[PDB]
Amino acid sequence: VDRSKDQLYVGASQSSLAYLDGSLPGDFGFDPLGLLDPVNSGGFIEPKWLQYSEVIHARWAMLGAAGCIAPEVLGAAGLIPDATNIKWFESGVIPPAGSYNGYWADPYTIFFVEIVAMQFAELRRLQDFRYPGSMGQQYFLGLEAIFKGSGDAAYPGGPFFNLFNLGKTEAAMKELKLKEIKNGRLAMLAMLGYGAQAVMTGKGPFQNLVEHLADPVNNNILTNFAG
Amino acid sequence: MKDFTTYLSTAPVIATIWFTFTAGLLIEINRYFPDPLVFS
Amino acid sequence: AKKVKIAVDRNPVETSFEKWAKPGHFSRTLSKGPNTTTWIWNLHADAHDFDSHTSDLEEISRKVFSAHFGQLGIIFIWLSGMYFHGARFSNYEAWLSDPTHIKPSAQVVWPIVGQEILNGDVGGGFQGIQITSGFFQLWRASGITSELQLYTTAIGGLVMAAAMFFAGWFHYHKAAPKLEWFQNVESMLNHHLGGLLGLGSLAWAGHQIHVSLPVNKLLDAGVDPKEIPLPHDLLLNRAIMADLYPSFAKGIAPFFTLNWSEYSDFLTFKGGLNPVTGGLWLSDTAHHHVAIAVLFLVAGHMYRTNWGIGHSMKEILEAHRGPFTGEGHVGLYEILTTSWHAQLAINLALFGSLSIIVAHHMYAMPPYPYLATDYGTQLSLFTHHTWIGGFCIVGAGAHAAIFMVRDYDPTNNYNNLLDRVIRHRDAIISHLNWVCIFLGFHSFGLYIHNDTMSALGRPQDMFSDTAIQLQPVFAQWIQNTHFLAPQLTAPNALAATSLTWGGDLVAVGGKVAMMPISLGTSDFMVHHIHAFTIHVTVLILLKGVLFARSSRLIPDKANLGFRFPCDGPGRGGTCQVSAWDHVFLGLFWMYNSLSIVIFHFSWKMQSDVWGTVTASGVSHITGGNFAQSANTINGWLRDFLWAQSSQVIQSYGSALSAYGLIFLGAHFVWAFSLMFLFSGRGYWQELIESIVWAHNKLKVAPAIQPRALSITQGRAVGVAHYLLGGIATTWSFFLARIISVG
Amino acid sequence: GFIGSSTNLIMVASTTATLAAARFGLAPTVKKNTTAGLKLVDSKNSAGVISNDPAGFTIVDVLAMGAAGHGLGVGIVLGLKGIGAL
Ligand code: CLA
Ligand code: CLA
Ligand code: CLA
Ligand code: CLA
Numbered sequence A: 001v002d003r004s005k006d007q008l009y010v011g012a013s014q015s016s017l018a019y020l021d022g023s024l025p026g027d028f029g030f031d032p033l034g035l036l037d038p039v040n041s042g043g044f045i046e047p048k049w050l051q052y053s054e055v056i057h058a059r060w061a062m063l064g065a066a067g068c069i070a071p072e073v074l075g076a077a078g079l080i081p082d083a084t085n086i087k088w089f090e091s092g093v094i095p096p097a098g099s100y101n102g103y104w105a106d107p108y109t110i111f112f113v114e115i116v117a118m119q120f121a122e123l124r125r126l127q128d129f130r131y132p133g134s135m136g137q138q139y140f141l142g143l144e145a146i147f148k149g150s151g152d153a154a155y156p157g158g159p160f161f162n163l164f165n166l167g168k169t170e171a172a173m174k175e176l177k178l179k180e181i182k183n184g185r186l187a188m189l190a191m192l193g194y195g196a197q198a199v200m201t202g203k204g205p206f207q208n209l210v211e212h213l214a215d216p217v218n219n220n221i222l223t224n225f226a227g
Numbered sequence B: 001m002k003d004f005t006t007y008l009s010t011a012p013v014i015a016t017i018w019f020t021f022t023a024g025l026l027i028e029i030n031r032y033f034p035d036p037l038v039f040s
Numbered sequence C: 001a002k003k004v005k006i007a008v009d010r011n012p013v014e015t016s017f018e019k020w021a022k023p024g025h026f027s028r029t030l031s032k033g034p035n036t037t038t039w040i041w042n043l044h045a046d047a048h049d050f051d052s053h054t055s056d057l058e059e060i061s062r063k064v065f066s067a068h069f070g071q072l073g074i075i076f077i078w079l080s081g082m083y084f085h086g087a088r089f090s091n092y093e094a095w096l097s098d099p100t101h102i103k104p105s106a107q108v109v110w111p112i113v114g115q116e117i118l119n120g121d122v123g124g125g126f127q128g129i130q131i132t133s134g135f136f137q138l139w140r141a142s143g144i145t146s147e148l149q150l151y152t153t154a155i156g157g158l159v160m161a162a163a164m165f166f167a168g169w170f171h172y173h174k175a176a177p178k179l180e181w182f183q184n185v186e187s188m189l190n191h192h193l194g195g196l197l198g199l200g201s202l203a204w205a206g207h208q209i210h211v212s213l214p215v216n217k218l219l220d221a222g223v224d225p226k227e228i229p230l231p232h233d234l235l236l237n238r239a240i241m242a243d244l245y246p247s248f249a250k251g252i253a254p255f256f257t258l259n260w261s262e263y264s265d266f267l268t269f270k271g272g273l274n275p276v277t278g279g280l281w282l283s284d285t286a287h288h289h290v291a292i293a294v295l296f297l298v299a300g301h302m303y304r305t306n307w308g309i310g311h312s313m314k315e316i317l318e319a320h321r322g323p324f325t326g327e328g329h330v331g332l333y334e335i336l337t338t339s340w341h342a343q344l345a346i347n348l349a350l351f352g353s354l355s356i357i358v359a360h361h362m363y364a365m366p367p368y369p370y371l372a373t374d375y376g377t378q379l380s381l382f383t384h385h386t387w388i389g390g391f392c393i394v395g396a397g398a399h400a401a402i403f404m405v406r407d408y409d410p411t412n413n414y415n416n417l418l419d420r421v422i423r424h425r426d427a428i429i430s431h432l433n434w435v436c437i438f439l440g441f442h443s444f445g446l447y448i449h450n451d452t453m454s455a456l457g458r459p460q461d462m463f464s465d466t467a468i469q470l471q472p473v474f475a476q477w478i479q480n481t482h483f484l485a486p487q488l489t490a491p492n493a494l495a496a497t498s499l500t501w502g503g504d505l506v507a508v509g510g511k512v513a514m515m516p517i518s519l520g521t522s523d524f525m526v527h528h529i530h531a532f533t534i535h536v537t538v539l540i541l542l543k544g545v546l547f548a549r550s551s552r553l554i555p556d557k558a559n560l561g562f563r564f565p566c567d568g569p570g571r572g573g574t575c576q577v578s579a580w581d582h583v584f585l586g587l588f589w590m591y592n593s594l595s596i597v598i599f600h601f602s603w604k605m606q607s608d609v610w611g612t613v614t615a616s617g618v619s620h621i622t623g624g625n626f627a628q629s630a631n632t633i634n635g636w637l638r639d640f641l642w643a644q645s646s647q648v649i650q651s652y653g654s655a656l657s658a659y660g661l662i663f664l665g666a667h668f669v670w671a672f673s674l675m676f677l678f679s680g681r682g683y684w685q686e687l688i689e690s691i692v693w694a695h696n697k698l699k700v701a702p703a704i705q706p707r708a709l710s711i712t713q714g715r716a717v718g719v720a721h722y723l724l725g726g727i728a729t730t731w732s733f734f735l736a737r738i739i740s741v742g
Numbered sequence D: 001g002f003i004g005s006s007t008n009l010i011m012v013a014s015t016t017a018t019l020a021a022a023r024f025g026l027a028p029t030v031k032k033n034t035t036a037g038l039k040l041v042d043s044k045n046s047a048g049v050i051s052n053d054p055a056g057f058t059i060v061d062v063l064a065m066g067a068a069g070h071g072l073g074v075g076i077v078l079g080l081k082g083i084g085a086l
């Protein structure tokens, strides 16, 4: 996967150029396994679902990448009490790695609210993919006015999801989508970096960066194989 | 549902339910009246 | 250059119960409904014969793919039940503390009609049926120490079973792969070599290195199971692992710096058996699966899929062309990518042969702790996996003949290896015929010679070790070569792979786990019985395949089909000429040959290996009577069948009384089968006519006209009952015997 | 120091040799299969990978010869330690 920008990436192949025509955001021709070929597609391996899933992964990853390091950066700057300067994997998500006592409820009590809240958010989002525009019809406390969608599942738009109606022009919107995808793809790799770095070193993402800057040669992946 | 209830009416399904019922009745009788040899 | 890609069709079929209410929908003949009772049998006989329902290869492939998901889902329910019953209805936790004195048990019966006597006294304050499946030994090796761990696996097994059934429905009714997808044999081998076998071996090595090895190291040291660290504590705390294995203190740097010798403490090459448990070292087993993982991952990069590099299987076949074989392997690639039966014939042949190899290697190199000293488990596992291999091989002959009748096309096969084999089939069968006659005389005739000489009071004239001798010199040479292998030919191995080659016995809990096996005159004679009965089974099955299409008797046998009873009483009589009947006859001989194999194993082990260790020495269960007694047929009747059947016939009134009942019941089913084998449906159709008359007289005659079974179904019903009765008879006799004394 | 040791030099040399051999037409590549006579002939690639290299050296050739180089290097390193040379 060619880093940076370019017309085509390293893995671009003549076979993938058949259907990759630049219509999708961040379409750099990289599809060595040819999972986006329209011909004889079905199930979840089809262009509409795979492109939709990438954006959803991009947006969750962007929140995760910024949220898995902010407590360490803010804690390092003294803007939050040291009691909350906690590594992302020691928040309580993985109790064996570490858990934080001091939340207003037991982490399982909080999880049930997460289940119910995400059931509504995710199943309503799904129903717009299966039946476009269907969430703007049945009464939902008057909120159905903002759930009418825009025909494209990954980009609902509307009064809320496009609060400040940025990208009014077609050219402007394409650039914003490209910027969203590149930041999202970068964050997805960052999250994978957090997970791999946590296992290899056992420290937070911020600690690894600080140590690397201290002695870059003596602190890197190669030296962390043994300690 | 009409077709599904038709499937349950097929010979193998009826026999399984019928013998499952018949066997259960005999097993339960011998559970509450163990070792019957003479009417008495 | 057709690209390798995913290809499916959307919603090929509709999910409805409509066809569940219309039996026979799959076939044009049976769709009209029943008029005679023959229709009912035809419904079940042809249900899974996809190749005859439709002529479309794509439709056939899609049914096979989803029918395989159903088989996988069923195994997960079965596996889940075995793990669940271990958690809830077993004495596994007690067994871990005292493995050498407590009998494994995982089945409990309800107290009804007085059957609670089958809940025997197995130990650990528990009553239940003793099991011989070896699940306790497997669970210990993997590191399972609580019933909670067994319970979680069972729940995971049910989730997998649900996933398997969803996949079958999904890939038939929702997204069915197209025919071009199924024909990527190069891609399938790459994934199944490096992905299924390769990553599967690597993943299991990860479990053994991180879970099995630490847990079993402490269990052998005598630590109480409840006080052992949990597997996740071992994973998270490198400090704990360093104590057991100091190599973990260095992390994974040795792996990437190629200092692989650092891992010598848990990646060993000891060989032999662990003295404390009598099973293979788990450190040896971990290095085995790590080595196997690399070999298969390399194997999975051999075939060309989408990026030029690799091999084309078609090109390999067409390049291997010699002077003696005409065209050669040309045309095999098209055969093996368009005929499911041809693929099934090969896979059943080797899968069955593999199951037999498993039986020999597992007893000789017991891979689990406390497997060897549990004689019931050793006998059961060897016998189970020999029978599985036997049936699979006979199936290989069955589906080789189906290919020959249905999928064989002469135009694609001209002067190639397949064609040339058909053109000298008389030469092959005539020679194999003579070899079987030669082997029958010079192996079974020796037993008749010994029986007659012994009855005449001429023991000096018998073939035996105290008389005319027949020493397996070739086998004895190999036993000695493998015994001395660690000295010169395998220098880095500390011990021989097995204790059967030679050396000293290993005893666990006062019982022999394995000791050298000596081969004498009796072993020479019995082995050549095996060669005789195996060669005859090949003759019957190979004859059916080579003559499936035509013979000097029926020149147009292919048009008659694969499964027909005869071509009439003409030409002197043509009963049982079809290739299906060669499987029917081959099943009897496979049963005959494997019965001697499992009798040979049972008597040899009890006589020469199994026993109790004491101060003076080893006393075996049957006291070493194999050498002197197994050279006559009378010896087998008296010393093996008559003497060892004492346990089963005295089982009434005890927890083993169930085996006594099944011993009689099996004898019954076997004899019942001879009714179908010795008779013909002509008698039975006339008998039903008189029976139908009585029902007609009482206005109680059925609308579906009763019919005697067909000719073929009489033979199928006969052999199925013959096999069940015969095999179940040995099954009861073995378990009641070995459990009672072993 | 691992860098510069015998183990490091052998692995770098073995990996470099395969890449050099494949790039300069001394080993089979994606665009050149080998006939039964161990001679390089043109091949057909289903997923023609675009490469700006003048010789058509694709990224697949790197993975193919990176693994081939590692296999050769690992065997030599462990083999020498077996005979006592390393
Ligand atoms: C014999 C097994 C088998 C095979 C050969 C196939 C083959 C196929 N499936 Mg099917 N499938 C299977 C089992 C199988 N499936 C099972 C068991 C399920 C139920 C869970 C499904 C559910 C399913 C769905 C829902 C879909 C397919 C689709 C497909 C197609 C594309 C698959 C692909 O590219 O995957 C590549 C794999 C991925 C993209 C996912 C990788 C990660 C998965 C989720 C987990 C893998 C776990 C791994 C094996 C072990 C990890 C170990 C450890 C780290 C935990 C193809 C025809 C798709 C289709 O129809 O396309 C046209 C499709 O939509 N399958
Ligand atoms: C996917 C996104 C995500 C998730 C799941 C988490 C999850 C977590 N974060 Mg992280 N975080 C994220 C993104 C995320 N974060 C991002 C993007 C940032 C950068 C801005 C941060 C910055 C951050 C910090 C600085 C801290 C956390 C902490 C936490 C933990 C405690 C959460 C908590 O107490 O919330 C509290 C709950 C809420 C804020 C939601 C309130 C819901 C009520 C009902 C709303 C009511 C509204 C009211 C009626 C009207 C509006 C009022 C308003 C105008 C004043 C938890 C593990 C804390 C931690 O690790 O503690 C140990 C912590 O200190 N996060
Ligand atoms: C509820 C879901 C559902 C429904 C309504 C249908 C409906 C249909 N399927 Mg589909 N199918 C499903 C689930 C379903 N399927 C699943 C889960 C799979 C994966 C295995 C498949 C795989 C599949 C195939 C491969 C085929 C169909 C076909 C069909 C058609 C006829 C099926 C029939 O006659 O079944 C009646 C049959 C049964 C009730 C037998 C059930 C067998 C299961 C596996 C249980 C086995 C138990 C086992 C023997 C236990 C041991 C026995 C021992 C103790 C005695 C029909 C359109 C056929 C079709 O479209 O033909 C044109 C066809 O070829 N289905
Ligand atoms: C498949 C088999 C397998 C697996 C899974 C493991 C796994 C492990 N081994 Mg083992 N090992 C194996 C085979 C295996 N081993 C073999 C064959 C050998 C013999 C050569 C060894 C020899 C060995 C040694 C000598 C050691 C280990 C160690 C380890 C542990 C740490 C490894 C490490 O540093 O990773 C480094 C980093 C990674 C593996 C990458 C992790 C990537 C994560 C999962 C990505 C997650 C991304 C995701 C998006 C983030 C979550 C987000 C979400 C929460 C929102 C780990 C549990 C070490 C240990 O701690 O032992 C106790 C150790 O010292 N192993």
Ligand code: CLA
Pocket (backbone or CB within 6 Å): C044, C045, C046, C047, C048, C049, C050, C348, C391, C392, C393, C394, C395, C396, C398, C399, C402, C563, C580, C583, C720
């Ligand atoms: C991977 C294994 C495998 C697979 C997938 C198949 C698949 C097939 N075989 Mg093959 N076969 C196999 C192994 C296999 N076979 C083996 C091992 C043998 C040797 C015994 C054979 C011998 C064989 C013959 C002789 C024939 C087939 C046929 C067939 C086809 C139709 C089968 C059918 O409709 O059965 C329907 C299923 C039944 C009627 C149920 C049979 C029930 C048995 C007899 C019960 C036995 C006892 C039971 C297991 C335990 C006790 C039960 C208790 C209630 C008392 C089908 C393509 C037939 C065909 O026409 O192929 C073209 C055919 O003629 N096979």
Ligand code: CLA
Pocket (backbone or CB within 6 Å): C433, C434, C436, C437, C438, C439, C440, C441, C444, C445, C448, C536, C539, C540, C585, C588, C589
């Ligand atoms: C105990 C029962 C029995 C016996 C003895 C035989 C014997 C034989 N069967 Mg048969 N068979 C049997 C049961 C038996 N079968 C059953 C139950 C079935 C139904 C499933 C079959 C189905 C069957 C098939 C389908 C085939 C055979 C074959 C054979 C032959 C094997 C090779 C051979 O010539 O060996 C040598 C002969 C013997 C061991 C017989 C006994 C010889 C004695 C001990 C020595 C000779 C006596 C001596 C000359 C003194 C005579 C004195 C007298 C003249 C006064 C052989 C004639 C195969 C065949 O024909 O291969 C060529 C073959 O294809 N059998």
Ligand SMILES: CC1=C(/C=C/C(C)=C/C=C/C(C)=C/C=C/C=C(C)/C=C/C=C(C)/C=C/C2=C(C)CCCC2(C)C)C(C)(C)CCC1
Pocket (backbone or CB within 6 Å): C294, D015, D062, D063, D064, D065, D066, D067, D070, D071, D074
């Ligand atoms: C000239 C040039 C250049 C350069 C380049 C380079 C410098 C490259 C490199 C490259 C490389 C440097 C690569 C590498 C690769 C590698 C790989 C791909 C590896 C693999 C491995 C493996 C696969 C392994 C395996 C194994 C294991 C793990 C265990 C043991 C056994 C074995 C060994 C098998 C550039 C482009 C800038 C520009 C233009 C010109």
Ligand code: SF4
Pocket (backbone or CB within 6 Å): C565, C566, C567, C568, C569, C573, C574, C575, C576, C680, C711
């Ligand atoms: S009807 Fe029976 S006896 Fe007559 S030829 Fe056919 S199989 Fe033989």
